[PDB]
Structures are given as C-alpha cells and as structure tokens.
Symmetry: C2
Amino acid sequence: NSEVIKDLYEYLCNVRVHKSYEDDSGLWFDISQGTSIMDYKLGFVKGQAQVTEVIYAPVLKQRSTEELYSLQSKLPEYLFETLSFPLSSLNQFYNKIAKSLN
Amino acid sequence: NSEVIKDLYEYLCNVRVHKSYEDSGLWFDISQGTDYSIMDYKLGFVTEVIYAPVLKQRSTEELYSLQSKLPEYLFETLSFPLSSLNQFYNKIAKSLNK
C-alpha cells in the first residue's frame, strides 16, 4: 500500500523511478519521464569530498526512430550525452527535462 | 527500498508524500519545497482531485513570503481532473522557485 503512493508520485510528477535491474549496488536507477517520453539512468556517487554526485546516462533503445526524431527536435543537445552534477542541482535538471518535453 | 525511491522522488521532484489515509475518501499529505519555500497541502480523491492548502505550520513571515509569489488560488480549496494534476504540481514548483 506504499504502492498507491507510488502511483501518486507518477501522476503528480510524471515520472517513474525504479531500482536498476542490471545493477545490484543500490546506486543506479531507471527513470521514465514523460507525457513524448525520455528514459534515463541516474547513478549516485559519494565518498571523496563526502558530497553526492549524480551521473545521468540517457537510455535510447526503447525509442522508435520516430520518438528519437521527436526528441532530437525538442530536447537540448546535452540531454543526449552522459552528464555529471551535484545532487543539489538534480531537481533543476529534472525541471529542464520536464519543460523540454512539454 | 521504497524509502529509497521516496528519497529519490524528494530530490528529483522536491515533493514528499508524508502519508496516506482513507476517511471523505482517499487523502494525501504533501510537502513541496525548494532561502527556501515550503508549501504544505492535501490531495483528496473523489476522477477528480481536491486540493486543500495546509498553512497551519507556516509562520506569518513565511505566509507573507508565500503570498508574494503564490497565486491567490493556491490559498483556496480547489477541485480539478486528474488529467491536470501534473500541470498543477508544475505551477506550484514554478511559484516556489522564485
């Protein structure tokens, strides 16, 4: 019943979040954002200076040629490359993706 | 596990669903935040959505601050279709991000 809550996030934020199927470290996440969809991964890297770094890796296979073509039009270039940023900038990054898709 | 996903949602979307309780219907306690602004509200389900501001834990200082950037209607109880929940979350996010 934390599942009815999961469905609420999904309606509210237009994003599905799952633990990475291929990964087992508990650090990788499959993310599905869209209303016109963009799939990607988020990796969480800490240690070092003890501040969490977020890696973003775009996932393109589940895209038809037509979806892909649609995204190339409305998404900024950098969303098609692997990125790296502080956890604190993560929401703003989510916001970028949200606007780009709308 | 689901606490991790929840943490993720909080960092990704700046929104936390504290709890859920059914009473009249299905209700959700929500916090949305970003100086930082926090707006508490409720989402009720009866499909339509009922939105009720929850201002009881704001200071007067915060109210004034929230008042200067939030559109009047976010201080009222509103009803609207599920098909528009997301844009609403979006309006709140935009308003708090000033």
